[PDB]
């Protein structure tokens, strides 16, 4: 979607492998703010939104 109508998808009830996001070189910017990128496989979350 466009940025004025940005699409929000709920992520819930899943096990997430973020290591395929870290190890992929396709992303020009992969920058996390309140959490380390390599600790994402060790934590549990709710209210995940893309």
């Amino acid at each position: 979607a466009s940025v004025y109508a940005w699409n929000r998808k709920r992520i819930s009830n899943c096990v997430a492998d973020y290591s395929v996001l870290y190890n992929s070189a396709s992303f020009s910017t992969f920058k996390c703010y309140g959490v380390s990128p390599t600790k994402l496989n060790d934590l549990c979350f709710t209210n995940v939104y893309a």
Binding site: G34, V35, S36, T38, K39, D42, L43
Partner: protein
Amino acid sequence: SALGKLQDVVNQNAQALNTLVKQLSSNFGAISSVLNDILSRLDPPEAEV
């Protein structure tokens, strides 16, 4: 209220201990007041801060 002088000292010491324990719940501007949450969420360059 006959024994208020001793009870005042006991209450002051217990209140000072309770305040010192309560001060651990404050984050003092950090992201969390729990050290384990910071050590499990962040890399050491920003977890150091």
